[PDB]
Design an enzyme around this catalytic site. Structure first.
Site, PDB file in Angstrom:
ATOM      1  N   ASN A 100       0.817  -1.212   0.000  1.00  0.00           N
ATOM      2  CA  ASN A 100       0.000   0.000   0.000  1.00  0.00           C
ATOM      3  C   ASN A 100       0.854   1.267   0.000  1.00  0.00           C
ATOM      4  O   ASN A 100       0.650   2.155  -0.829  1.00  0.00           O
ATOM      5  CB  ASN A 100      -0.951   0.019   1.203  1.00  0.00           C
ATOM      6  CG  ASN A 100      -2.023  -1.056   1.131  1.00  0.00           C
ATOM      7  OD1 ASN A 100      -2.415  -1.506   0.051  1.00  0.00           O
ATOM      8  ND2 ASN A 100      -2.517  -1.463   2.295  1.00  0.00           N
ATOM      9  N   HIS A 134       2.847 -12.769   5.218  1.00  0.00           N
ATOM     10  CA  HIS A 134       1.961 -13.372   6.226  1.00  0.00           C
ATOM     11  C   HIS A 134       2.728 -14.276   7.157  1.00  0.00           C
ATOM     12  O   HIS A 134       2.268 -15.363   7.528  1.00  0.00           O
ATOM     13  CB  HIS A 134       0.787 -14.092   5.555  1.00  0.00           C
ATOM     14  CG  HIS A 134      -0.199 -13.156   4.888  1.00  0.00           C
ATOM     15  ND1 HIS A 134      -1.409 -13.565   4.461  1.00  0.00           N
ATOM     16  CD2 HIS A 134      -0.121 -11.788   4.605  1.00  0.00           C
ATOM     17  CE1 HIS A 134      -2.067 -12.521   3.919  1.00  0.00           C
ATOM     18  NE2 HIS A 134      -1.278 -11.436   4.010  1.00  0.00           N
ATOM     19  N   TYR A 169       1.638 -10.566  -3.500  1.00  0.00           N
ATOM     20  CA  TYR A 169       1.829  -9.248  -2.904  1.00  0.00           C
ATOM     21  C   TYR A 169       3.006  -8.480  -3.517  1.00  0.00           C
ATOM     22  O   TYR A 169       2.906  -7.275  -3.752  1.00  0.00           O
ATOM     23  CB  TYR A 169       1.966  -9.383  -1.384  1.00  0.00           C
ATOM     24  CG  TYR A 169       0.780 -10.098  -0.770  1.00  0.00           C
ATOM     25  CD1 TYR A 169       0.834 -11.467  -0.483  1.00  0.00           C
ATOM     26  CD2 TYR A 169      -0.412  -9.415  -0.508  1.00  0.00           C
ATOM     27  CE1 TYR A 169      -0.256 -12.128   0.067  1.00  0.00           C
ATOM     28  CE2 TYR A 169      -1.508 -10.067   0.040  1.00  0.00           C
ATOM     29  CZ  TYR A 169      -1.428 -11.422   0.325  1.00  0.00           C
ATOM     30  OH  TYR A 169      -2.517 -12.071   0.868  1.00  0.00           O
TER      31      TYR A 169
END
Length: 633
Positions: A165, A220, A228
């Protein structure tokens, strides 16, 4: 700082098409019609945030078209007007002040697109129109609205952001500051940019999130998870431009992509998203891929890219998850743990769906339908460690072997020793000591898939059953999508014949049926090889002295030895060994025994990356790689 700003805009426009080819979330060559109310026809962006996302991507797609010299609407003045008008419309709908920890419309968590995609819209429109009458207005709109919605590189609408992000956010944020007149040297020093610099550095780590020492990307906590990395990879070029080549571990990241990807976009499913996928439409554009065999000795991945095929095996270590499920996806563990497949580079890219994801070459089935569910016990994702995970990998110039010992509690205590060898132009697979919990299969025989096909896809192969019957009722040499299968017999090891079965309506299989009795005693075995269509070889495998001492002679200059915990590959003047226990010393007795097993007891050898130590040789450096390499005469 005007020349710095203008140089960047020039660079941005020059590389836009290339950058776009790397960007995971996009709409390519849009042709959607313009609308004065909703920017584009047939969308409801002001109530539906997904539709707003579509509006955003479509505008960006149109920027790429406008900027592309080969596009019909290259530098088209009406498109330029449509782009600036589109931005005007979006700006007219944005709350001011921006909300605090709420989306402008829709629920929370629909914040994405406002924070991620929208600022990219401002950036793309402003830059591609930089030579036009619309530039000053676009730039002024960007300065104002990004000042509100992206007040720092890492903050948006009352939320702090990290990871992928923040990587997305920093690109238009940095540009917004450049428009305000700040130099890249000043922007670099900002707290938010400093966070992003840490986030993109990608130093080698030994555990947790990030780039592990052997260049496999983990997320994760313990999941091999390239989805990702793939999502924000396109941003790296921007940071490298903005702040220099030194801000990213480019060597590490390049190796990470080499270790799993391919030019065609085929990627081993065990490192990809949870729905079960072997394809990315951007990964092929990340780097120039070498023809090579790659190994990640700690994270457990062996990957080969040749002129004819891509092949890969995700191994198993107790240190990392063998599977990750979510509330929707929970049937993908067999694919993640047992894919033993080569894909013809000229073949059709057939991706998995709900009906086919339980089936691939190498998958051991415990039932006829093959459904093996491992539900997430959280409200979102859950990853699972294997009960046993020990894997060795050895590679030479064109060949690579991987030896896996695994046990999976959540798959009915499924265990196996797995032996895979990749070479030009094929792959040997031997499972032995296949076991499940005794008395758990309700008198149903297991089966090891050798070939699988999605029946909806019209390749120009006849069905597996038709091929069998044409071939004198033998499934030997059955072909699918540029790959050919054969059974590989090994004297004194049980290797079932190839048989054809359709489990569900969507799938046809060639498989080796294994008795449930031997599965109960963890002594079941299966053995096959795949060839690139048009290639054949005289590969032979042998049990030598002991059930676990398996010598493979490909017959073309490649030999391999699986002798758990040790694996060995020999090709030309090179030999590589590795232990599944990850030993950093190899006893000379292991070397001698190995060379005897493969029929070369008097083989002359000297260490290449290790040194005489104790009862054998110790690795020069065990930080990144765990293979003992020797030169032979």
């Amino acid at each position: 700082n005007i020349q710095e700003l203008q140089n960047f805009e020039r660079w941005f426009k020059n590389n836009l098409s290339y950058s776009f080819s790397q960007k995971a979330e996009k709409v390519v060559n849009p042709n959607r019609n313009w609308n004065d109310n909703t920017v584009f026809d047939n969308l409801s962006p002001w109530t539906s945030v997904p539709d707003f996302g579509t509006v955003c991507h479509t505008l960006i797609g149109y920027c790429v078209r406008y900027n592309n010299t080969s596009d019909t609407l290259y530098q088209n003045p009406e498109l330029a007007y449509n782009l600036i008008n589109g931005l005007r419309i979006i700006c007219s709908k944005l709350p001011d002040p921006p909300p605090h920890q709420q989306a402008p419309w829709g629920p929370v968590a629909d914040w994405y697109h406002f924070t991620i995609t929208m600022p990219e819209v401002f950036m793309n429109i402003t830059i591609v129109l930089n030579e036009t009458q619309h530039y000053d207005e676009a730039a002024s709109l960007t300065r104002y609205w990004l000042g509100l919605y992206l007040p720092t590189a890492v903050n948006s609408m009352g939320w702090h952001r990290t990871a992928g992000n923040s990587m997305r956010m920093g690109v238009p944020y940095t540009y917004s500051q450049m428009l305000r007149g700040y130099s890249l040297a000043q922007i670099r020093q900002e707290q938010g940019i400093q966070e992003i610099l840490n986030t993109i550095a990608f130093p080698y780590v030994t555990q947790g999130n990030g780039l592990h020492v052997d260049s496999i990307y983990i997320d994760h906590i313990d999941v091999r998870a390239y989805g990702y990395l793939i999502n924000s990879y396109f941003t790296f070029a921007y940071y490298t431009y903005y702040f220099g080549d030194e801000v990213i571990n480019t060597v590490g990241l390049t190796r990470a992509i080499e270790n799993v990807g391919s030019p065609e976009g085929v990627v081993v499913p065990g490192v990809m998203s949870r729905n079960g996928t072997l394809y990315s439409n951007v990964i092929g554009n990340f780097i120039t891929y070498p023809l090579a065999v790659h190994s990640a000795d700690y994270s457990k991945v062996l990957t080969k890219l040749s002129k004819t095929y891509y092949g890969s095996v995700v191994g198993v270590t107790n240190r990392l998850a063998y599977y990750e499920s979510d509330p929707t996806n929970n049937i993908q563990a067999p694919l993640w743990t047992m894919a033993r497949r080569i894909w013809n580079r000229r073949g059709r890219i057939i991706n998995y769906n709900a009906n086919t994801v339980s089936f691939e070459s190498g998958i051991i089935l415990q039932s006829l339908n093959g459904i093996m569910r491992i539900p997430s016990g959280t409200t979102s994702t859950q990853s699972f460690r294997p009960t046993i995970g020990q894997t060795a990998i050895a590679k030479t110039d064109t060949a690579g072997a991987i030896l896996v010992y695994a046990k999976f509690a959540e798959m009915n205590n499924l265990q196996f020793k797995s032996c895979t060898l990749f070479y030009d132009h094929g792959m040997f697979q031997l499972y032995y000591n296949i076991g499940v919990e005794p008395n758990s299969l309700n008198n149903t025989n297991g089966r090891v898939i050798v070939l699988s096909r999605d029946t909806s896809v019209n390749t120009n192969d006849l069905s597996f059953e038709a091929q069998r019957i044409n071939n004198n009722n033998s499934s030997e040499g059955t072909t699918f999508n540029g790959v050919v299968c054969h059974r590989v017999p090994i004297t004194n090891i049980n290797v079932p014949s190839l048989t054809v079965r359709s489990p569900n309506s969507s799938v046809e299989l060639v498989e080796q049926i294994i008795s449930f009795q031997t599965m109960y005693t963890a002594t079941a075995s299966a053995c096959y090889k795949l060839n690139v269509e048009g290639h054949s070889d005289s590969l032979r495998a042998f049990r030598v002295n002991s059930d676990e001492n398996i010598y493979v002679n490909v017959g073309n200059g490649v030999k391999a030895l699986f002798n758990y915990p040790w694996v060995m590959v020999k090709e030309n003047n090179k030999v590589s060994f590795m232990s599944a226990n990850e030993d950093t010393t190899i006893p000379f007795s292991v070397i001698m025994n190995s060379f005897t097993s493969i029929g070369e007891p008097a083989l002359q050898y000297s260490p290449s990356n290790c040194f005489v130590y104790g009862n054998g040789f110790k690795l020069n450096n065990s930080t990144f790689d765990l293979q003992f390499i020797f030169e032979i005469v």
